[PDB]
Amino acid sequence: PQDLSEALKEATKEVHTQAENAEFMRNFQKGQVTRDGFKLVMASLYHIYVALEEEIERNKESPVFAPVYFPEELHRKAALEQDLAFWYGPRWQEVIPYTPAMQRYVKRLHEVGRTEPELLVAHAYTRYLGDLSGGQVLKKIAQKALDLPSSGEGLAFFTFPNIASATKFKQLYRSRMNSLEMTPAVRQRVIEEAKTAFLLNIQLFEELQELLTH
Template structure:
């Protein structure tokens, strides 16, 4: 049953249901899931925050080549994740979390790749072995256990986008990256990217 209004016993107002689950209960379940994911990933998050790469990055010690490799890994990761999310957008476990307009990152990452590598970036960017294995896992999950995409989406969107706001400012200063909008690769006055 898609989102429809139903009157529930003991309630003064109709209650919206998503896939047969009352909105209040669905919201509670989502909050519980968010807390479980946060607690379940805490140790991994702490380890990731304490890698030498992240410590150096936060201090502004950023080598452009490593930044390019990290951006490349994100491009391949989000491409796979968003492909599987789109494939599974109607799956009951994932449908309530499907917000492509608000969350999808692939288009922005393509702009980043064009900026970092140039016009023919696809010929230059190579997927690392570690990223390839992660991409394969995302595809495996999307095709066989799509409910597990929730954990991957949580890690990427909540982790990358939340922590990414801090890292963005550091990278902009250290690498002298543009502060707003997409970088313009065509420095013509009437360029559509400005």
């Protein structure tokens, strides 16, 4: 379609479904998720967001990203640090896993951020808008499946404190995306990069499922 945001949503319909159909996520949706499985996804997210937000801060003033720079509304790193301290303990930094599939995702993020900046919006879109949409249904399933103690920690990642209205914010974000100026060629690569983002998540889900079934 004309609007970039509309083009992204349409082009990634297929891959988003594969993400949903992935064995690990199927089990997740079916409410079938274990603490060992959930700890792995949280560890993954920490690594992914550290890299993503590291690159966002690097190109925050570039006209290829500035329009969608919302640091206070979206930053998740601090939230994940808090969560991992709960799931893995005070020494979480020394014990959390950093797998090959997590590394492949992180590696692509730094490449885009350092050599293909104009494609960063594709990864920010995929992660931020997805976690802000499907993230809340998974939040509901997670807590009613994890049987957590009432310690008041472990799920800060699923709450965006600086965003009063999700729908309202997502509309604003869509607008800022459509305001980005790019040659039709660049637009094609941003669309493809978004699909690549889903594929990186899907291969991660495949790997985590493999690690948990031994």
